[PDB]
Amino acid sequence: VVPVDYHLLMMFTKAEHNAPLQAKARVALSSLLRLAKFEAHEVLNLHFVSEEASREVAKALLRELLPPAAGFKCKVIFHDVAVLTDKLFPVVEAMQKYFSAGSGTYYSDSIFFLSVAMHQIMPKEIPRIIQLDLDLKYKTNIRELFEEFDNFLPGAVIGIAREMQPVYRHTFWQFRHENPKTRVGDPPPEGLPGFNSGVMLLNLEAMRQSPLYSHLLEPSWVQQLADKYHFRGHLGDQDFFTMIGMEHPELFHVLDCTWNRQLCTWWRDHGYSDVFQAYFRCEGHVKIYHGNCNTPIPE
Amino acid sequence: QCESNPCLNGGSCKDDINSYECWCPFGFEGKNCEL
Numbered sequence: 264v265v266p267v268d269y270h271l272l273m274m275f276t277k278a279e280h281n282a283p284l285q286a287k288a289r290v291a292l293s294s295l296l297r298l299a300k301f302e303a304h305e306v307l308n309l310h311f312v313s314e315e316a317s318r319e320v321a322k323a324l325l326r327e328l329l330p331p332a333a334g335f336k337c338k339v340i341f342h343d344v345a346v347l348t349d350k351l352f353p354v355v356e357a358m359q360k361y362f363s364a365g366s367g368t369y370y371s372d373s374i375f376f377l378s379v380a381m382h383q384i385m386p387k388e389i390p391r392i393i394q395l396d397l398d399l400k401y402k403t404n405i406r407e408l409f410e411e412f413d414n415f416l417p418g419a420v421i422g423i424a425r426e427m428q429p430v431y432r433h434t435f436w437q438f439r440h441e442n443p444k445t446r447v448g449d450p451p452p453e454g455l456p457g458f459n460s461g462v463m464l465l466n467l468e469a470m471r472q473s474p475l476y477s478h479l480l481e482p483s484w485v486q487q488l489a490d491k492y493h494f495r496g497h498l499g500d501q502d503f504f505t506m507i508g509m510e511h512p513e514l515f516h517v518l519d520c521t522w523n524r525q526l527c528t529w530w531r532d533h534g535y536s537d538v539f540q541a542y543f544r545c546e547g548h549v550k551i552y553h554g555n556c557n558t559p560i561p562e
Numbered sequence: 563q564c565e566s567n568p569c570l571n572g573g574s575c576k577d578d579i580n581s582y583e584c585w586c587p588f589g590f591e592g593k594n595c596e597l
């Protein structure tokens with residue numbers, strides 16, 4: 264049989280002496296592996312971006328969890344955060360001042376943009392990868408998410424779920440102020456509430472092959488849009504995708520909210536009581552819970 | 563990581579060095595929209 268590879272990617276850095284992160288990782292990876300099923304000729308590739316201390320932590324966690332019950336072939340790969348940072352920087356430098364905490368352009372923030380230039384960082388033998396946070400809980404077989412790739416319309420490069428808090432209502436304040444009729448920052452079903460980067464289907468081939476996407480990476484395009492939108496953030500890739508998603512929604516296949524059910528309610532308590540519900544509403548059978556802002560996941 | 567700026571103006575991080583006013587979202591007041 265011709266062996267079929269599946270690729271996932273998780274950030275796992277500064278994990279030594281960070282027990283809350285290790286426990287998050289444990290919850291994520293154990294639910295992931297318990298519920299995954301793959302055919303005999305299929306292999307699950309788990310990519311981790313780690314410095315060397317977090318690599319050893321991850322290996323200790325992984326040996327306790329592998330091989331999986333379901334018995335499918337699983338391969339672990341580590342990528343050096345320092346090597347990726349240096350590769351990302353030329354591509355990612357100019358966007359850093361708009362989307363990092365806070366000013367200006369530091370190496371330590373570069374890795375938060377990994378997804379935006381993943382198509383240039385991963386071997387070309389990797390056509391698609393799903394980047395996932397480690398504060399997740401999987402309620403289904405991860406193999407099912409991969410069929411969302413087939414629903415990408417012509418010209419879409421990335422699959423992503425909506426942001427479930429009014430953080431972008433707040434962020435786009437001045438643009439909203441100047442454009443009373445905009446849907447930028449409004450709740451669903453009809454508004455553009457922005458994206459959450461916890462679960463992302465990165466079609467590396469489509470990204471590589473998109474002339475629009477490639478232009479949007481260029482310093483002067485990043486600058487023109489952040490100026491148009493008066494955009495300032497500190498959430499990295501999420502911010503950049505959210506922003507270019509306002510200009511060019513065709514780039515994004517929007518996933519059902521059930522694939523990334525965010526639980527964070529920080530913004531409810533910081534100025535958005537009245538509208539919070541319209542952003543946070545998510546109905547349907549939950550496939551992945553996302554315990555963002557350290558929010559405990561229900562069981 | 564920084565804590566989000568509760569103010570509607572300035573940078574994304576709270577206590578933005580380059581900000582002097584704090585425009586709070588409705589129903590909040592204080593130098594960090596506390597009350």
Ligand SMILES: *[C@@H]1O[C@H](CO)[C@@H](O)[C@H](O[C@H]2OC[C@@H](O)[C@H](O[C@H]3OC[C@@H](O)[C@H](O)[C@H]3O)[C@H]2O)[C@H]1O
Pocket residue numbers: 396426428430459460461462498501527529530555556557564565566567
């Ligand atoms: C404002 O600051 C507060 C206090 O530090 C944060 O809790 C807020 O961030 C929360 O609310 C908005 C979410 O977008 C955010 O979760 C995202 O963070 C970036 C990605 O790493 C991640 O995949 C995504 O879930 C959440 O932590 C902040 O807006």
Ligand SMILES: O=c1ccn([C@@H]2O[C@H](COP(=O)(O)OP(=O)(O)O)[C@@H](O)[C@H]2O)c(=O)[nH]1
Pocket residue numbers: 273274275276277278284395396397398461554555556557
């Ligand atoms: O010290 C850190 C902080 C974050 N992360 C990774 O980056 C993601 C973003 O942080 P987190 O999910 O805790 O915050 P959220 O943005 O979801 O509130 C995490 O899932 C981790 O995979 C990490 O590896 N080390």
Ligand SMILES: [Mn+2]
Pocket residue numbers: 396397398399461553554555556
């Ligand atoms: Mn998360």
